[PDB]
mmCIF file of C-alpha atoms in Angstrom:
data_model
loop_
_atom_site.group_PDB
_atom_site.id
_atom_site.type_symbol
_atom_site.label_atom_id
_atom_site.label_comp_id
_atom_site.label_asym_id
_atom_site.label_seq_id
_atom_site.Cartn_x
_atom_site.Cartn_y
_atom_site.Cartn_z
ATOM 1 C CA UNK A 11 0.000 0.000 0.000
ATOM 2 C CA UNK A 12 1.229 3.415 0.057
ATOM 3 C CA UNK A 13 0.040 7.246 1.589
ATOM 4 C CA UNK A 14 -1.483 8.351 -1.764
ATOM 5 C CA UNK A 15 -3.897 5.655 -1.346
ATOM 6 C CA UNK A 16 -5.418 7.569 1.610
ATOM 7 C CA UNK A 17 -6.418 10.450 -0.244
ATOM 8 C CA UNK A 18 -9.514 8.404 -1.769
ATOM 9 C CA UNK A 19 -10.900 6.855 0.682
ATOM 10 C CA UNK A 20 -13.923 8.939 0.755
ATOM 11 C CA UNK A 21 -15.558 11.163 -2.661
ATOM 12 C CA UNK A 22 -13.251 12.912 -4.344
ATOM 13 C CA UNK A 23 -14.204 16.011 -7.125
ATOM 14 C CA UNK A 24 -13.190 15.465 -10.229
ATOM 15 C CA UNK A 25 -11.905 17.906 -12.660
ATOM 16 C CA UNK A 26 -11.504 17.634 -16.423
ATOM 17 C CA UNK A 27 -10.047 19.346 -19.588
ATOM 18 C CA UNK A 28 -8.843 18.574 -22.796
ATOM 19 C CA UNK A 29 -7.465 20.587 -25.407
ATOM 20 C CA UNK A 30 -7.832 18.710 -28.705
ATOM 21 C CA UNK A 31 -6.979 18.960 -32.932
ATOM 22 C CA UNK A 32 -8.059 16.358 -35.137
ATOM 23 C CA UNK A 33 -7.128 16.627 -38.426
ATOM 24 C CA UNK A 34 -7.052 20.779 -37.813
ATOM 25 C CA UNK A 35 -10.236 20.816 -36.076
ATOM 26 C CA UNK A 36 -9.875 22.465 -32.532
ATOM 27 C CA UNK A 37 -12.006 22.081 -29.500
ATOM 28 C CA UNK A 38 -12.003 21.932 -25.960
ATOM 29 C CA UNK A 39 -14.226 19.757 -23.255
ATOM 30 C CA UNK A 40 -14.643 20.491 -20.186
ATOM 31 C CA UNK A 41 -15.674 17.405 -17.378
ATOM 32 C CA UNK A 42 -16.765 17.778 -13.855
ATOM 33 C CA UNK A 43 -17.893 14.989 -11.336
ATOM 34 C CA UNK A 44 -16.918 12.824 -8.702
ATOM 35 C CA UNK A 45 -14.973 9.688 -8.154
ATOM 36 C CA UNK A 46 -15.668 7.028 -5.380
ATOM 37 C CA UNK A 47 -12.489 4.222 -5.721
ATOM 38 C CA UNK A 48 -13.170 2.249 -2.855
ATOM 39 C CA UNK A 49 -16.081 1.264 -4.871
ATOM 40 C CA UNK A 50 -14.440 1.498 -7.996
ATOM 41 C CA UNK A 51 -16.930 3.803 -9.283
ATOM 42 C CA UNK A 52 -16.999 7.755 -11.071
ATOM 43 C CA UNK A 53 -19.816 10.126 -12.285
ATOM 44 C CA UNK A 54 -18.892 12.790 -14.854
ATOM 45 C CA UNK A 55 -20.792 15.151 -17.040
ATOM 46 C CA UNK A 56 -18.433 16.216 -19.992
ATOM 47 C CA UNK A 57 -19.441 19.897 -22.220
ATOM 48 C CA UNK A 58 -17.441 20.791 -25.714
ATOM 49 C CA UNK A 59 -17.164 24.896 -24.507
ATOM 50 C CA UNK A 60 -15.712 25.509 -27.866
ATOM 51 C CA UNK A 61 -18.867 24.177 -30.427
ATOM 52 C CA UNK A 62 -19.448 20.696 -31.044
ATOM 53 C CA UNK A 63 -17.363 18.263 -31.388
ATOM 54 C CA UNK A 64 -15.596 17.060 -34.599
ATOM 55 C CA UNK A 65 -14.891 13.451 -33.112
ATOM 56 C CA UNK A 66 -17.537 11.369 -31.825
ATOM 57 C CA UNK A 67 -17.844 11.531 -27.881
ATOM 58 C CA UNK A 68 -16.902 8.031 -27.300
ATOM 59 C CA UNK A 69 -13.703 8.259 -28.853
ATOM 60 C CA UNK A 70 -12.762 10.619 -26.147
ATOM 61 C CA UNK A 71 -13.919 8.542 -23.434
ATOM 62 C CA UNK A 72 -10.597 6.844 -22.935
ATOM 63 C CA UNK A 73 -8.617 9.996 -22.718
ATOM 64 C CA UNK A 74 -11.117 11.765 -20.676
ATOM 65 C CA UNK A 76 -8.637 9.046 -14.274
ATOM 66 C CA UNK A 77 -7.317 5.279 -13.366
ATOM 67 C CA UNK A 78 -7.042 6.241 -9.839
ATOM 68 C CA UNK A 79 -10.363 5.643 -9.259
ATOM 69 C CA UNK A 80 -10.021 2.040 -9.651
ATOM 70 C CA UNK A 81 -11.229 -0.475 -6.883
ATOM 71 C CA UNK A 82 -7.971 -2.053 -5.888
ATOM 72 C CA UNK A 83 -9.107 -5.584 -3.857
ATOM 73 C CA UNK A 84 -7.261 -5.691 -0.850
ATOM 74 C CA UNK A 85 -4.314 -8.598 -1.769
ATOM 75 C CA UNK A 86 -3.925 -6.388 -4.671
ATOM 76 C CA UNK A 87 -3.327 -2.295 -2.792
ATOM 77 C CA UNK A 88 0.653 -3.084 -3.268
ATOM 78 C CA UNK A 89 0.437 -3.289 -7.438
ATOM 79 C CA UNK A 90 -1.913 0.041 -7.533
ATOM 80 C CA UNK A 91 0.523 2.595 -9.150
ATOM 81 C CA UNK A 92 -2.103 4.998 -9.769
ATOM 82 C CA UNK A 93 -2.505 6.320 -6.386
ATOM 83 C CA UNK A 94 1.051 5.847 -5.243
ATOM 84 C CA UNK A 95 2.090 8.704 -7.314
ATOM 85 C CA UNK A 96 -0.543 11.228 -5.866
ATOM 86 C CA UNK A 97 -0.878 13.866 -4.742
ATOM 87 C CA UNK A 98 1.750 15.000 -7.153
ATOM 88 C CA UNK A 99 0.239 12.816 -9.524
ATOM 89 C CA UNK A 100 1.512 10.849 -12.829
ATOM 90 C CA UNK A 101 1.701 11.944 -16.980
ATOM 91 C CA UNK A 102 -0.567 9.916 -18.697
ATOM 92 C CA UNK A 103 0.639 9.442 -22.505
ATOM 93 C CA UNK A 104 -1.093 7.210 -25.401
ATOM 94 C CA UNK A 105 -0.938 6.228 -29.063
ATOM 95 C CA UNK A 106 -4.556 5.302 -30.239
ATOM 96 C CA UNK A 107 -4.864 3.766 -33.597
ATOM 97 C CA UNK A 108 -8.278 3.505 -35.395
ATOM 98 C CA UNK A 109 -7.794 0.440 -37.571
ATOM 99 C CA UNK A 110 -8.457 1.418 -40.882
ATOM 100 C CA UNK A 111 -8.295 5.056 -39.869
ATOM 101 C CA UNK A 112 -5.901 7.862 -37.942
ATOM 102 C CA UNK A 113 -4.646 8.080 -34.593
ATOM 103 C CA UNK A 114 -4.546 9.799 -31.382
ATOM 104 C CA UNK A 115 -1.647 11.356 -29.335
ATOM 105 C CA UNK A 116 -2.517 12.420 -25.797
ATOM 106 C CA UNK A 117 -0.554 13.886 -23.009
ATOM 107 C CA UNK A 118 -2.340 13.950 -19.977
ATOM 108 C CA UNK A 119 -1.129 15.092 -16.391
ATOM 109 C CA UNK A 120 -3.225 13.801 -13.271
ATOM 110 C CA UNK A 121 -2.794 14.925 -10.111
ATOM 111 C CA UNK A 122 -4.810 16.951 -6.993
ATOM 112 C CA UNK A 123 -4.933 20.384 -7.206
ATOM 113 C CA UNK A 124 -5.514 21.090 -3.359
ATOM 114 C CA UNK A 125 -8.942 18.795 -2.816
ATOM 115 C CA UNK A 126 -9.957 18.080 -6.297
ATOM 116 C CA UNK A 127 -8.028 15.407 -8.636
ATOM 117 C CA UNK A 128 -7.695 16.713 -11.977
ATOM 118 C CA UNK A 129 -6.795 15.241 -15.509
ATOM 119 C CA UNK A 130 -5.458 18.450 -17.624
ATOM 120 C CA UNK A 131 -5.291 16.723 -21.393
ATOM 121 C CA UNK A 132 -3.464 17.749 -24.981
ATOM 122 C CA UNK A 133 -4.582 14.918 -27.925
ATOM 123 C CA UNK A 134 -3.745 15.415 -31.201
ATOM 124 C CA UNK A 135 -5.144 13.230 -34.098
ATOM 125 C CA UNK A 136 -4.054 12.997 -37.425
ATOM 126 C CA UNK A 137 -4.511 10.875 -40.297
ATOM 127 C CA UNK A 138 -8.462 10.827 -40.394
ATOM 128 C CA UNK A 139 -10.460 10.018 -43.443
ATOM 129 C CA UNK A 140 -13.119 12.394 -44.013
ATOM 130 C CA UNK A 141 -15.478 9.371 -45.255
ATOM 131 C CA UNK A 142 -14.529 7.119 -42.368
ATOM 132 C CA UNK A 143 -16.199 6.223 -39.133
ATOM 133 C CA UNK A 144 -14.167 9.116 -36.987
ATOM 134 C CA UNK A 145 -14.676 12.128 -38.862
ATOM 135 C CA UNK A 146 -17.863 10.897 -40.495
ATOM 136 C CA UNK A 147 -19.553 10.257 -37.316
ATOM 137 C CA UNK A 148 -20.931 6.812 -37.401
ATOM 138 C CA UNK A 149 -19.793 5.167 -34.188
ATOM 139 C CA UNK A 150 -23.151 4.500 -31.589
ATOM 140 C CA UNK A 151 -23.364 6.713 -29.038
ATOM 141 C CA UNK A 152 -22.552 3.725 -25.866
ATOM 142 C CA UNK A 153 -19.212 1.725 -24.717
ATOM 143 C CA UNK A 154 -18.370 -1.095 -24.273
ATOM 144 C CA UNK A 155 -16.249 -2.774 -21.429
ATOM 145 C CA UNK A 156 -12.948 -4.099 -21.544
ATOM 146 C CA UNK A 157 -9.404 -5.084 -19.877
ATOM 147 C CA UNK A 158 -6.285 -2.924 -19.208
ATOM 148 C CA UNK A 159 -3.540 -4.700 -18.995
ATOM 149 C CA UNK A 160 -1.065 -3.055 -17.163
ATOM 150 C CA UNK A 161 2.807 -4.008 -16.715
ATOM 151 C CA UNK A 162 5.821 -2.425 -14.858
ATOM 152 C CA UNK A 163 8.017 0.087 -16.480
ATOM 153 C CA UNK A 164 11.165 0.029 -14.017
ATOM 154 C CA UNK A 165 13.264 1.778 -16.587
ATOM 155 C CA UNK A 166 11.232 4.861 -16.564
ATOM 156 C CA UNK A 167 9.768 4.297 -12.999
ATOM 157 C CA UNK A 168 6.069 3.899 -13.867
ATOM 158 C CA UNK A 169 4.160 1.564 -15.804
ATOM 159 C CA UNK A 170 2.559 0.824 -19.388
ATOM 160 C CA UNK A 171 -0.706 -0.526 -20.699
ATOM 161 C CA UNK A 172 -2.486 -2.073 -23.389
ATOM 162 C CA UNK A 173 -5.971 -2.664 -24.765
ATOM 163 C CA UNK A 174 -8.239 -2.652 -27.255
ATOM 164 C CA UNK A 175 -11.367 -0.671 -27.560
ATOM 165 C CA UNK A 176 -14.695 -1.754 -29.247
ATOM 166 C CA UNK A 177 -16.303 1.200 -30.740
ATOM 167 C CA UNK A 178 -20.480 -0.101 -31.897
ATOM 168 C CA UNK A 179 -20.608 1.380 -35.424
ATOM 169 C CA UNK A 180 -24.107 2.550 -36.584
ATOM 170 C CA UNK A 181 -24.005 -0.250 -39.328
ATOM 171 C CA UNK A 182 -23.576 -3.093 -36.565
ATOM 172 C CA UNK A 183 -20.281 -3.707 -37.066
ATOM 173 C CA UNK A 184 -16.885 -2.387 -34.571
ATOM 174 C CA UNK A 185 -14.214 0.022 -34.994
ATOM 175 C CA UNK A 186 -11.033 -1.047 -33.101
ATOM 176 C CA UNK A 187 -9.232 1.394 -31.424
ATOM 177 C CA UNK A 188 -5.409 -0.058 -29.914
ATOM 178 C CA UNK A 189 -4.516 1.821 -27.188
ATOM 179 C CA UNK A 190 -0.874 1.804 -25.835
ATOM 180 C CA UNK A 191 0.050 3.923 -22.844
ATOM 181 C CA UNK A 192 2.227 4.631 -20.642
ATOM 182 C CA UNK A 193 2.524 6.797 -17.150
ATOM 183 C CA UNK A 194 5.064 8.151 -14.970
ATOM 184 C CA UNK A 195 5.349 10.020 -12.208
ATOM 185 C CA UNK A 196 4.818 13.884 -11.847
ATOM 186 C CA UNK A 197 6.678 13.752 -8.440
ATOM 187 C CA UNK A 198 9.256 12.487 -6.418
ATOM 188 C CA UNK A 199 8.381 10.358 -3.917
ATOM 189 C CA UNK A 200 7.519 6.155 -3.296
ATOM 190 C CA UNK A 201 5.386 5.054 -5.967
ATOM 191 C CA UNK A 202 4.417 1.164 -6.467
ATOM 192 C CA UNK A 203 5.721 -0.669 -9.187
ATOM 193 C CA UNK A 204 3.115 -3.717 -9.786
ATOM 194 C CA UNK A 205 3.249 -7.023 -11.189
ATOM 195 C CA UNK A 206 0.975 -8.112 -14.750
ATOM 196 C CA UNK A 207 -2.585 -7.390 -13.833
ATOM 197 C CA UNK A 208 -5.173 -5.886 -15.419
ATOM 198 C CA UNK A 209 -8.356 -3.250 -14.825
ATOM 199 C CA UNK A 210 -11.558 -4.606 -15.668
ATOM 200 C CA UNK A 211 -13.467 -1.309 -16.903
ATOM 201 C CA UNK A 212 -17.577 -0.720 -17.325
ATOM 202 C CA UNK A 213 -18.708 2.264 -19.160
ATOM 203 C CA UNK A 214 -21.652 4.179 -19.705
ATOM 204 C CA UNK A 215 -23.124 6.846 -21.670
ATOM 205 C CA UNK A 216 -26.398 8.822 -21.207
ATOM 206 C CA UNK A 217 -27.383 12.965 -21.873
ATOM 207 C CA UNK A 218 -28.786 15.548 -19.738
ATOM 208 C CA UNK A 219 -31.822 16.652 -21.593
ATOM 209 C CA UNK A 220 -31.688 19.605 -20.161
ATOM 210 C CA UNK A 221 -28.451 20.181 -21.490
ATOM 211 C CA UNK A 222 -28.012 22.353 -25.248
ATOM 212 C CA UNK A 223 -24.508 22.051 -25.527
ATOM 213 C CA UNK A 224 -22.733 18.742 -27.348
ATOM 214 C CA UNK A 225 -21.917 17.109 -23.588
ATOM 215 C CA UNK A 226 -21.645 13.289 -22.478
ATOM 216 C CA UNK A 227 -22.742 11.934 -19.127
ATOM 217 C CA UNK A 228 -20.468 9.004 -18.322
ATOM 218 C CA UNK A 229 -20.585 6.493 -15.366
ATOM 219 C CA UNK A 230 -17.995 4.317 -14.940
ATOM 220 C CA UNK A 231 -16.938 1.132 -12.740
ATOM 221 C CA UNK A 232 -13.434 -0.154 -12.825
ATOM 222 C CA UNK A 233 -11.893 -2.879 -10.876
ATOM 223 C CA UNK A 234 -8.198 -4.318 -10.671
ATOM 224 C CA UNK A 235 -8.364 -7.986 -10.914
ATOM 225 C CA UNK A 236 -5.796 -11.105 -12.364
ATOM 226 C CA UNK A 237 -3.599 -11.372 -9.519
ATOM 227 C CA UNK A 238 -5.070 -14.891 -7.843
ATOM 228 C CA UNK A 239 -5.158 -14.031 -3.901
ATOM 229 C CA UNK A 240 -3.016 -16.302 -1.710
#
């Protein structure tokens, strides 16, 4: 275990923003919520203050807090994520559409007095205006998946992979690779884990009250593939 892990044992605000160009297109989303992880669990309510967006919402989902991740108990030793805080961790990924372009994001998490914030850059490049991306044809839902982490000693931190199932409007699925890694912001003891991976539940709804191109996300996330002893 480690002292960052104390810092979320209760609710915990949540901040968001992203800066992001696609193909040329800017924008910029703004999320705000809360994040419970000794149940695993966060509420969010993302807004594009910029316009709409030019991507479709659940492409962003990924890069839009791994902290929040229920941790069982014979597993609090391999949980990097809070080790690192408060001065928190950079969050970087490649994520390549098959078929299409890709995603570079730069994220730094970390609390900013009470509230843990994810401050994001992502540029994409590479899109094809007649493809699922910039022609907006993925469904508007998520699906749930594994993160397999891994140690990084080298650089101190760790890396991940996974593979995202975006629901296309025609009943088929755009892939979406993701390959990340994260180091810390910070100085002091982090937790270097063994192979194990986050078993992630997402989903999407709308405020109808809300004009403004905005997702409502819930998520549930749970470490898991270490076998307890």
């Amino acid at each position: 275990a480690s002292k960052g892990e104390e810092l979320f044992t209760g609710v915990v605000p949540i901040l968001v923003e992203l800066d992001g160009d696609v193909n040329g297109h800017k924008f910029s989303v703004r999320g705000e919520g809360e994040g419970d992880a000794t149940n695993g669990k966060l509420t969010l309510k993302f807004i594009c203050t910029t316009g709409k967006l030019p991507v479709p919402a659940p492409t962003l989902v990924t890069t839009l807090v791994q902290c929040f991740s229920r941790y069982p108990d014979h597993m609090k030793q391999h949980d990097f994520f809070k080790s690192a805080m408060p001065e928190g961790y950079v969050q970087e990924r490649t994520i390549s559409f098959k078929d299409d372009g890709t995603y570079k994001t730069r994220a730094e998490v970390k609390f900013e007095g009470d509230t843990l914030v994810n401050r994001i850059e992502l540029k994409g490049i590479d899109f094809k205006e007649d493809g699922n991306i910039l022609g907006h044809k993925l469904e508007y839902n998520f699906n749930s998946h594994n993160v397999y982490i891994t140690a990084d000693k080298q650089k101190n931190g760790i890396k991940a992979n996974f593979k995202i199932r975006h629901n296309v409007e025609d009943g088929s699925v755009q892939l979406a690779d993701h390959y990340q890694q994260n180091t810390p912001i910070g100085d002091g003891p982090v937790l270097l884990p063994d192979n194990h991976y986050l078993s992630t539940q997402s989903a999407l709804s709308k405020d109808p009250n809300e004009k403004r191109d905005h997702m409502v996300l819930l998520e549930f996330v749970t470490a898991a593939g270490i076998t307890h002893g």
